[PDB]
Amino acid sequence: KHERFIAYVGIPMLTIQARENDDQIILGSLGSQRMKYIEDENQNYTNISSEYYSQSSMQAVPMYYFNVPKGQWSVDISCEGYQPTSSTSDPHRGRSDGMIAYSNADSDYWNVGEADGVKISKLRNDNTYRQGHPELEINSCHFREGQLLERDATISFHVEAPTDGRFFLVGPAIQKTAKYNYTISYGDWTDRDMELGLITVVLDEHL
Amino acid sequence: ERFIAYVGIPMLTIQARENDDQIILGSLGSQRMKYIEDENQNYTNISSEYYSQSSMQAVPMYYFNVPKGQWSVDISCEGYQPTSSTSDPHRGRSDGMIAYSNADSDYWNVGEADGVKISKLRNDNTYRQGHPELEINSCHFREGQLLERDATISFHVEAPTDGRFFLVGPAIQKTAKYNYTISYGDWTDRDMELGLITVVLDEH
C-alpha cells in the first residue's frame, strides 16, 4: 500500500462575444474543460465540470469541480488568472487580440468550497494581483479606474472524504461591462476565445 | 539530493524614451529564484550575464548548479517581457512590454559548462503572435512582433564533479519596433521581466 498522488493541470477556456471595446461583452457557456490528469503512474487528458457560480448583468463567476476519492488528503492549488483573448475567425491560429481585465474589489478572489461528500479544513488562501499603470493603453483604452491585469492565488487545505466526493474552485469574476473590455474593436459581434487562467491542483493522500 | 528545483522570473533594468527610440539594457545580474530541496522551500540567487550582444539585440544566459551525480533535467521557459516603472508611484504596475523577433535563430537553449555532459537533449520552442491590429501604447504588431517565446526542454546531465549548465534565453530586442512601453520625454528606467523559468533536477 502507498499514499496516492493526484494532480490536475490545465487552462480552462471560455468563448465570448465582443463588438467594440466600447460595449459590454456576452459570455458563452461553461462546460467541460480539458485538463491533464495524473494519478501516480497514470496520466491522461480528462474533462472537468465547469459552470457559473453566480451571474449578473455586471459579471459572472466561474467554478471548477474536482473529484476527491475516498480518503484523507492535503490539497495544494496554484492559480494564475490572466484572461487574454484571440479572435475565433482570425485566419491564423491563436493570435492574441487583447484581454478582459478584473475588478479591483476586495470580494474578487480565487476561493474553494465543499461539494457533495467532503469536509474542508485548514483553508489557507493567499491572493495577489498585477495592476496596470494608469496611463497604460491597450487598444485605445487606459487603466485609470484601476482595472487589474492578473489575479493569482495559492491555496492549501485538508479535505476528508468519507465517500467519493467533490470540491469546487471559484475563479475571480469575469467582468462583462466595457470598463474591462480591452479586446480589438470589431464591426459586429465577433466570437473570441478567452483563457480563464492556469490552474494546478495537487492532492496528496494521508494514511 | 534526489529532487532539486529552481523557479523564478529573472529581472533586467532597461531605459526607454519615446516610441521611435531604441531601449538601453542595464546589467546582468544576480537573479533571485525560489530554491527547492525535496521538502525544503528556500530562496537563492543564480548567476545571469550576456551570452552575446549587438547594436540590435542581446541574448541572456543563466547558470544553474548541478551537484555531483546523474540527473534528469526538465525546464519550462515561459518567455514574456512585461515592463514596469522603476520609481514610485507605480512600481510593479505594468506599463508595457518588449516584444520578440520572429527570426528562426532566436530561441531558448542550454549548453554544458565545467566538465558536465548533457545528453538526450530535446528542445521544443514555441511562440505566440499578436493580432496585427492589436495595439499597445499606440503601437501595433504589423511586423510579426511576437508577444511570447516558450520552450520545453528535457535532457540528462552526467556530473562527475559539482558543475553547472547554462540556459540561454531568446534575444532581447533593442530597436524601437519591439518597444511597447509608455513613451516619455526623458529616458525613463523600467524593470523588464525576462520570463518564468522552471528548472527541475531528478537524480538517477
Binding site: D193, E195 | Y127, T198
Partner: peptide, 17 residues
C-alpha cells in the same frame, strides 16, 4: 514550483525551426 510539469501555453503555434 510544483512536481507537476507546466503545460504548453494556449494558442502557441509550434516552432518547427
Amino acid at each position: 514550483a510544483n512536481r507537476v510539469r507546466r503545460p504548453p501555453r494556449e494558442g502557441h503555434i509550434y516552432m518547427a525551426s
